[PDB]
Design a protein around this ligand. Structure first.
Ligand SMILES: CN[C@@H]1[C@@H](O)[C@@H](O[C@@H]2[C@@H](O)[C@H](O[C@H]3O[C@H]([C@@H](C)O)[C@@H](O)[C@H](O)[C@H]3N)[C@@H](N)C[C@H]2N)OC[C@]1(C)O
Length: 296
């Protein structure tokens, strides 16, 4: 699915006739949504497909709830679409947040003082977010990790039966068995997490040299809080392990060794996710890649 500018303008003007669009342009494009910037004050997201539509819904449902409870700015919901055909939510419109993504490059050009400060600021955020009371959220927001794995294991065998020989397939089973036999990946206290906590979603003020917002809650869910630290650890694309080590100290984490153990798993696991996401997105280059990494 893709949208023209006209199409988009119709969608909004329709449910919101007493709201005129002056400037519209594309702020960016994701795997689930295209993001349009309207009047320079708003980000409107349009889903590119049914699953994206569902994430959008959650992002909306979630931001409403945690609106005005966190240390840093997050987006505010202002405009909502309608369910329709296969899409649960047509589109949505959030307030724009001034800022630049705090890319790892940027991060290391800041003086050590502003670096140590951002560490402390993120820790505070993650800390608050993970404290929010989960008793009100409906069950479907609880991501059960053990189910996800089992579900994945099955999708894989379908998709790989006609790609792999007995002795190759037995290595995947071995791998999944080892994950599922390990209690550490599952025995956590669930809480609300961002679940895509990367640099691309951390906004930064070039004047003040301080973090000035957080932004994509499309994947947010009730899950293992360690996931919000792991997403920052990959060395090439995200911040260091060394930087994330500081966040953890201000967050006063009790089991850092466990978190690293989870990272190593997720990193290996990502191979399999490329295959799954690759087939349904479908990026065939994701699918070819994962198939080669697996063979190890
Ligand atoms: C719902 N969509 C999400 C989507 O947001 C995205 O998340 C990325 C994630 O892929 C990246 O992380 C992943 O992808 C990168 C790859 C793109 O270079 C790999 O280097 C890395 O090992 C892997 N963990 C991470 N660096 C940023 C997140 N925002 O990819 C995963 C996803 C589940 O499809």
């Amino acid at each position: 699915r893709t949208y023209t500018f006209d199409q988009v303008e119709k969608a909004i003007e329709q449910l919101y006739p007493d709201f005129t669009i002056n400037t519209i342009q594309i702020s960016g494009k994701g795997n689930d949504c295209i993001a349009y910037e309207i009047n320079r004050d708003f980000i409107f997201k349009f889903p590119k497909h049914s699953r994206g539509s569902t994430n959008l819904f959650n992002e909306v449902n979630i931001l409403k709830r945690i609106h005005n409870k966190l240390p840093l700015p997050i987006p505010e919901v202002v405009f909502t679409g309608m369910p329709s055909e296969t899409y649960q939510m047509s589109f949505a419109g959030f307030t724009k947040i001034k800022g630049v993504p705090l890319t790892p490059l940027l991060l290391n050009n800041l003086p050590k003082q502003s670096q140590n400060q951002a560490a402390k600021d993120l820790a505070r955020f993650l800390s608050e977010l993970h404290s929010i009371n989960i008793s009100g959220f409906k069950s479907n927001l609880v991501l059960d990790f053990r189910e996800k794995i089992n579900e994945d294991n099955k999708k894989i065998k379908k998709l790989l039966s006609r790609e792999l020989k007995g002795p190759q397939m037995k290595k995947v089973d071995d791998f999944y068995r080892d994950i599922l036999e390990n209690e550490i990946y599952f025995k956590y206290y669930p809480c609300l997490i961002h679940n895509d906590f990367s640099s691309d979603h951390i906004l930064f003020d070039t004047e003040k040299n301080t973090i000035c917002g957080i932004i994509d809650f499309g994947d947010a869910a009730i899950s293992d809080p360690d996931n919000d630290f792991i997403s920052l650890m990959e060395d090439d694309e995200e911040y260091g392990m060394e930087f994330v080590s500081k966040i953890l100290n201000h967050y006063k984490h009790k089991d850092i060794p466990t978190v690293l153990e989870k990272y190593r798993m997720k990193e290996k696991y990502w191979s399999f996710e490329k295959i799954i996401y690759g087939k349904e997105y479908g990026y065939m280059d994701w699918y070819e890649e994962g198939l080669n990494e697996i063979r190890s």
